[PDB]
Amino acid sequence: DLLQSKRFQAQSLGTTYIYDIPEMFRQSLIKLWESMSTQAFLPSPPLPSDMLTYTELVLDDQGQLVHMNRLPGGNEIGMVAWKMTFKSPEYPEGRDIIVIGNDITYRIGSFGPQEDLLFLRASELARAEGIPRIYVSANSGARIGLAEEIRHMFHVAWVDPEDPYKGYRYLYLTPQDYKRVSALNSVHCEHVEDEGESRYKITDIIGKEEGIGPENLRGSGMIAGESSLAYNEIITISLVTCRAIGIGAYLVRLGQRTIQVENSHLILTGAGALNKVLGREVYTSNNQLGGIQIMHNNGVTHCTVCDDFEGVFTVLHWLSYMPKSVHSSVPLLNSKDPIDRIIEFVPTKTPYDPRWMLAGRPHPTQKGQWLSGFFDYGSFSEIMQPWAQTVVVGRARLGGIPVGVVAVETRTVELSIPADPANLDSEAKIIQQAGQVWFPDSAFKTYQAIKDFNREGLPLMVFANWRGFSGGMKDMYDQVLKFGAYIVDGLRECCQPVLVYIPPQAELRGGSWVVIDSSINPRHMEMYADRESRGSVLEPEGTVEIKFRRKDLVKTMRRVDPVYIHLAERLGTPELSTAERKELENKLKEREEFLIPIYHQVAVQFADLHDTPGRMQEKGVISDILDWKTSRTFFYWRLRRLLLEDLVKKKIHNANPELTDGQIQAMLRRWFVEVEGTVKAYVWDNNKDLAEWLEKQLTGVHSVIEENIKCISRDYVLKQIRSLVQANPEVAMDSIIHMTQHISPTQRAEVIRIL
Amino acid sequence: DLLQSKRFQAQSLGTTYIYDIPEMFRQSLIKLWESMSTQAFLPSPPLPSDMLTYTELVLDDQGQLVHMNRLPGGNEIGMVAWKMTFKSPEYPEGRDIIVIGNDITYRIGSFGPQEDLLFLRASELARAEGIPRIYVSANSGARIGLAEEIRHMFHVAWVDPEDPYKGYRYLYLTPQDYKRVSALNSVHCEHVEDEGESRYKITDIIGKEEGIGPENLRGSGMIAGESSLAYNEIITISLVTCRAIGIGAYLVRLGQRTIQVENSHLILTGAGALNKVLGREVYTSNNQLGGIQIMHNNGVTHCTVCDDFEGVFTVLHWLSYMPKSVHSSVPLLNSKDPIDRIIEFVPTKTPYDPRWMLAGRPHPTQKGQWLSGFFDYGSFSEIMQPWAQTVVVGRARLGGIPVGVVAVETRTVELSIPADPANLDSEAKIIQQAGQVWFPDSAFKTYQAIKDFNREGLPLMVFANWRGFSGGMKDMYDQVLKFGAYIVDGLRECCQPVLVYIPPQAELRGGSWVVIDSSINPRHMEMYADRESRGSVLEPEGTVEIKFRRKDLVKTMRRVDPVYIHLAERLGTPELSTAERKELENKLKEREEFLIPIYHQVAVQFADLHDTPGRMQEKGVISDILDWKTSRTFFYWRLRRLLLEDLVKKKIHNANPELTDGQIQAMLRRWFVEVEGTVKAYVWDNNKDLAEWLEKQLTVIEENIKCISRDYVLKQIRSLVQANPEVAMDSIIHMTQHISPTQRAEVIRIL
């Protein structure tokens, strides 16, 4: 087939032929079923033929999408798209996605207006159904061209033919040549008599070939816009295979979640172009500009893979944490890591890799045993690892509930900054980034993680351990203030549970606390402190510095140090010689000075006792003091009901949008007490037990809530009709005639009663 | 006396006493009336006493906001707030704002929970009424403290009393001392028997004094959140007077639009704190960290002023471009700069300050005349000038219509990067930033302008002249790709007209075009190109490089160059000596090489002819080709009707929310033709004439809308009952009230 020819052509470009992608999904999906059986209890996999179904989406005459079951290799434009349904470990009954891909073999994978349109319409469909959009990008950006019909027939109006370097005046077509293109919308000319001959001065070249013109600019913008909207409406993921150029780059980025194969590059302008502009061979490879060594290191790319197969797997792997559609809840697994276990790994005052805290680590002594982490064994999947490494973000599972995750590096990061080849001064610098601090990069990565996960529909778990934002000259100049603010915007827009936990030996202070306080989004945020955690506006050393200065240290001495006491007691005698006095005062001053260091230490301790969880809870800024060993169990159940409670409350809100978050809470709580009895109030505060109860309501008499909501809606619909008539009374009479047109003859009787 | 005392205390801190702020508004407002009479025809100003009214907002017992009539100097917390109404040149019948301010004299302007709550509630009120929120920031961030009641009575459990430096075990209270604080929520202890005596080991200190604890952390977060929301709901402006620290800093930023007095600073941690952490005196002054030389240069601060008075003026100056409330349209002036004039200043291939294009410039020869710019004389007010200077942003007025403005620098910028004192290697670098390029900074500044203006409710005018984003190693690493994308997000959210115009000698290419195409937000965006503009996916030189390579240049020579043609003709001669041949072939290759440069120029020209406005319009990517001299007149009217049309369409959408943007357009257009006659269809395409017509209607259509609503309300009541029939009976009971006893008789004839 031309098929053999095209696959070779793709391989020779270091990518996969577009129509091989679907089967690459099937193979990857098999690998997923295998890898996940480690982590969870799964049913027996389906047979591979029943595992996946695809249908090609193709543009009709009217530019409308049409589902077509045709043989591969049939594309007449440089873009291909499919709807795919497949059975996965997390969604064994099946889940749908839309996949769009460039065909790098068709016109070097350029983006013409038709290519742009298919992309648009596939995206539009993804949004229509609420399902994720996967884009495989391997392209050359917007299509380029010159009007062939004119190129081969134009003439130059030389200042002087016997010397061209004396300049030219204009380009033109002979009347013979004009008389043919003229009918066809190819050029605009103005006739002129010049040097004796009659000529057609070319003023504009329009070009009879559609798709090589500024229409491509609109088309590109068009799908740029679409992608911006998509990110905000559905799950978007993108895989960069060979190269994504220009609009290709922008689409990949607007999609946000990005996988990049090694040796692929993601660029706006090519090393060649730039070298010509700079007058020498500055850059040797596009990877210098757009390779993973730029984009993985700056957070544009989330993950890198060695090949296309591993790319597709990653897509499916990510989706395994994500709800099937936007109308859907997060997909739960039955994990092999039990829920009622203790966490063996313990965070320490000594610095440590926080990945150990999340995923666990190998045992230092009797290997190959395993010090268990907080999350389900094998569930933590990081992203953006090498960028802003002061913070660590990823997805994991807690009892098989997928969550998004943020944690803090405690060890000093050593950031390597590559040399700018453009600039001959630049050598590769090496920067210290302290642990437990937000820098501009870290703050940005944190914000990004918050946004992305939130749009996937995941709950959030923040393991807060930040001493502050770096507030030094450089970092302030580098806009650390701007990005700290963003974290606030980010959390405020969260729509599912956000649980913040200060782990043992962690601390949370001042600026860092303020931008993640539960107050920002009380509807959804919750804050917890381990017994062995600490938190304040200001750390003890800095507090003492301001509010336990010398005068106060000495006061403390006067109360506690016996020597000072004795001396002070004597200065408190009347009728002393000014001699004896000055001697005493000096003895006291010497004592004071000798005692200051130790008493300073006492002072920081004193301050530290103010910063405890005990106080935090008492003052109402945290929901509970937890204990790390059992934090996993706690959080499973808590998250589990937060999710269920939310699900029911969402139903209530639909019944009557006018009801406050607050009144809704109360209403549900009141309905529980009504059903289960005033005697059982306390149960409400038990996560496990309320979780079981809520679930039974949602899945004869477990139509108790369901009945109340029907009530709430009836009432609202009444209030709504009332409001309309209040505003529009001439409408009353006719509304009734229409309303009565059918109802029970015994209700017609009643109507007459009431009026 | 206390007031005298407090004002001196403020002045000694280089700021203004809080209760003097209101009168600083009155004085500033007078200055505004004076400065704007230059620009615009105004009524006579009102008398100063009638110009402005303020009323102090105060927290009641229930934590609720209350208007209160009391004498200045009365605050019992470190925050003060007022509702203000004043008559201004742009809003002479009056406009309202909410003003909140720290009292730096009360507990060094710290933020306790009560202070936090007043701020919250004043902000809430602003949002409630849709009016702007002005925050005057002069503060020390979150309040700090230690439990006094415990500090003066705790004891230390020494490892050894005969030597304290042998360490201590714990702190504690004597039972005598415990027996009193215990009742009062001050501490947590556990009893212990130790060294014979009975002690109360202190485990947690809670502190009976409210406001010095972690409640302050919640309170701060609380108003951070509020400010984030407020920015997205109403106009927010902030003035930094002495210093804003921590939460103060964040609130200033969340508010976004930020005026900073010189020598003030805006910081997270003080130079002292940091120096302690770093073990050396690295920083000498908070201005190093947060002074205008940092924040004006990185776009956190929009403007700087020399003193507080000029600050308040700036606030009022900015507001003069902004609608009274969110329920309100942009405030129009009758400007003294006429609408039907030509623009005298003309953009050039030679680089130039684009401010000249906007504001005009002084005449090079016969001064003091003035080469007029595009916008109303004296109307252009820039922001973020020294940051990312490759782009220029600000607000201006076009025929007295305020708009937000983005333009592009054409001259090379020289960026100075200061040395990091933390790092002893760092020497101050100096960077070239090419004109007509988006860099990360320029892109971010452009995004930020877009967002800020859009939330003010201003239309947008972009004078596009970008060759592309910088795509070089450094800038790619520096995330230029991320910020380019943001521009798209920014324009997509715009809710009022966005008019893009490629000025004469400007160009718009590839990446830069795609992120601002009208396609992103077709409901509101429009794109225009001057005859003398150019645009492509790729510039000519780069297009030729790819698609008019040597083979094709030589092909052109073989067709056109007579010498080459002649030689080629001969290389076709029979029976030649291999000598004569090799000579001819060489003469050809030499000719070719000689001709290449000139023919490459020909090729770029050919490419360039593809990049014209003619083509752009023809292919449907721009709405019209304009001519610069008359572009002001054009855009005034166009903007003017886009605004009026939008206003009417908004009314239609209200009458029936189910109608599409599309069907609404059609409906209005159809109504016009109905009213004015099928003969007059063409008028619709005349901005001025349709503008006049629309205005007449808004001051026959009004009837049609009433119709559309009645219909909708009917269908809506229907639809509700269809879905919810148990509701029928009760809906009738309520409905019967609104009907004639003779209609009840009718209903009965069928019920």
UniProtKB/Swiss-Prot annotation, chain B:
Residues 338-654 form the CoA carboxyltransferase C-terminal domain. GO terms for molecular function: acetyl-CoA carboxylase activity; ATP binding; identical protein binding; metal ion binding. The biotin cofactor is covalently attached to the central biotinyl-binding domain and is required for the catalytic activity. The modification Phosphothreonine is found at residue 573. Residues 1-334 form the CoA carboxyltransferase N-terminal domain. Expressed in brain, placenta, skeletal muscle, renal, pancreatic and adipose tissues; expressed at low level in pulmonary tissue; not detected in the liver. It is found in: Cytoplasm, Cytosol. Residues 1-654 are annotated as: Carboxyltransferase. Consists of an N-terminal biotin carboxylation/carboxylase (BC) domain that catalyzes the ATP-dependent transient carboxylation of the biotin covalently attached to the central biotinyl-binding/biotin carboxyl carrier (BCC) domain. The C-terminal carboxyl transferase (CT) domain catalyzes the transfer of the carboxyl group from carboxylated biotin to acetyl-CoA to produce malonyl-CoA. It is linked to Acetyl-CoA carboxylase-alpha deficiency: An autosomal recessive inborn error of de novo fatty acid synthesis associated with severe brain damage, persistent myopathy and poor growth. This is Acetyl-CoA carboxylase 1. It comes from Homo sapiens (Human). The lineage of its organism: Eukaryota, Metazoa, Chordata, Craniata, Vertebrata. The chain holds residues 1581 to 2338 of 2346 of the full protein.
